[PDB]
Design a protein around this ligand. Structure first.
Ligand code: HEM
Length: 153
């Protein structure tokens, strides 16, 4: 459970992210796809994208970045009370998209890398520690629902 002090650190950086959701989404998804190429193969709509420059130029990729960060922000702002938000997401990513829990660890590390690049002063070690904890909670609740449905991992 995150303390109230840790939630403040998370949401304080997230307000910055919300200044430019689209730029953030894009960096995060390009980072994910470059670091872990096997993740790009889950997206039929992005599989044709071969270079970083092509990724940077795709308007549809930038659109999906916004989609992702908007659903994440809606969860983070629940400060743990995110049951109604998390449960449709787990259901679809387990049963429809077929995303292993491991890829959610990957995209968490991408989110932390980009936050660190764009917001030093607001993302020191204490903030980075609270953001990790939040993402771990997110991943742990998703994994419980995966397990239920018979996909755990
Ligand atoms: C920070 C974690 C993530 C969030 C909040 C999230 C959120 C979303 C949302 C809200 C949608 C659209 C509605 C739906 O179909 O459920 C979606 C679709 C999708 N997500 Fe995620 N997702 C995340 C991580 C991942 C990862 C890591 C992968 C793949 C490596 C992934 C693959 C997909 C796919 C394949 C689609 C459908 C794309 C299409 O429209 O063709 N998601 N995700």
């Amino acid at each position: 459970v995150l303390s109230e002090g840790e939630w403040q650190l998370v949401l304080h950086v997230w307000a910055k992210v919300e200044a430019d959701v689209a730029g953030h989404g894009q960096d995060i998804l390009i980072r994910l796809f470059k670091s872990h190429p096997e993740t790009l193969e889950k997206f039929d709509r992005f599989k044709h994208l071969k270079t970083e420059a092509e990724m940077k130029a795709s308007e549809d990729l930038k659109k999906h970045g916004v989609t992702v960060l908007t659903a994440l922000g809606a969860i983070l702002k629940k400060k743990g009370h995110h049951e109604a938000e998390l449960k449709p997401l787990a259901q679809s990513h387990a049963t429809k998209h077929k995303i292993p829990i491991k890829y959610l660890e990957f995209i968490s590390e991408a989110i932390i890398h980009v936050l660190h690049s764009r917001h030093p002063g607001d993302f020191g070690a204490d903030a980075q520690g609270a953001m990790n904890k939040a993402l771990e909670l997110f991943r742990k609740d998703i994994a419980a629902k995966y397990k239920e449905l018979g996909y755990q991992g």
